[PDB]
Amino acid sequence: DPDQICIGYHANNSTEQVDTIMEKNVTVTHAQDILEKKHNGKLCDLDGVKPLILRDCSVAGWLLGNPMCDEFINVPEWSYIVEKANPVNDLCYPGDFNDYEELKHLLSRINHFEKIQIIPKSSWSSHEASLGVSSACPYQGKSSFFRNVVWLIKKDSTYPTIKRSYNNTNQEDLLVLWGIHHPNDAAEQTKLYQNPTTYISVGTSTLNQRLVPRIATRSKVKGLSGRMEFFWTILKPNDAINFESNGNFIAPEYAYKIVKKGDSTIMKSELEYGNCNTKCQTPMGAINSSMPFHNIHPLTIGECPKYVKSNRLVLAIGLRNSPQ
């Protein structure tokens, strides 16, 4: 029988299939998926700075010191903030936070953060500073209030006009918070503050604010028709903030030194910290991948693959292989 030589190619036991532009379900000897589909199921550090995880508090409750929140633990820097979808503890006393979303964005990523006392609670000689409490803000079965600001009321049927300054002698920007109380009617107004017609003026080198309380008949929320409305500014180094008021003033006691480099955002997630590190975080887990595409979640923070609506992206590596 004559001798033969033949040309041919590799086959194996692979049942892996790919699609081509002209033909579906082509069985090949080897293939490779380029879609990332896995995450670790945990909230991690980002490059590798820890997030601020607020458990059951909103950014506002945390900043103002809502007493129903966990006690303030100093975290001097973070990469992103995690809130639950619906934090139970936000504003214990009902009301509003001015420019709240911009403030949250500003605080999303922070390089240095430090709470300091700027106006001692003990320094209010002409006003009552230890009766500013409410059943809406309990601490240990007793009426209390946001811990970082002070609800001042009249003393000896008198509310002298307040003139207070704080000068930022620090080398860092200072986040300062204050508020106004909106009472229910004129009888309540004079009961708390004596003076019927009141204001709060606040000035810096850029801020020129004058607040006045609005009376309205409002629905009771947690038994209260009154409202607190909070405000904030960034006090630059060597600038001074000047408060003036003859009533309704929710004064600062504590403020926060901040150093701001980059920004990130607020992640909504029900997960807890996982003692891990990552380049790409999603609300249901982190991604560790050099793949070009992923299908896990759109609300990512970090350096992530491109998000696609796909179950698989499989590249042929090897050759057409007879199927089983």
Binding site: Y9, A11, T20, I34, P292, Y307
Partner: protein, 167 residues
Amino acid sequence: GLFGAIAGFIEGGWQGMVDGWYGYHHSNEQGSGYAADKESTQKAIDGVTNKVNSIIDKMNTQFEAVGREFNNLERRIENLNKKMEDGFLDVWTYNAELLVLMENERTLDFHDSNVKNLYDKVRLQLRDNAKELGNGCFEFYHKCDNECMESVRNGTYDYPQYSEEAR
């Protein structure tokens, strides 16, 4: 396929050739066996590996922070973000799906080309000293022992040495 060799005139692959992608099967009085073509296999591996790595490495990745920071009276702006997000999702989804389909066609046709080219290299060495059977095989008109078979595989087949016995 495009080059007519793989699942074409060469009707199927060889489970028996385990050490390469393309190669040869010989049969003579001394026996039979498979030998991988090392050079074409390695070049093909490098080629496909480069393609995959380019698809991966050419992607520009940058830091972004994707959340939902607009309020109940900022729904028009929130809708602007929706249209943008959905828009980029549609772009990347389409481009990724078609890229995979198109490159898979290229890869399979590349292997086919590689096999056709190997076939032709042999064909032109053997010329008139063997019969081209049409199935990827050549039937020698002379005895071709193991050393002769290796000469064909390494591209040094000596046609003048055998032409007399072939005729």
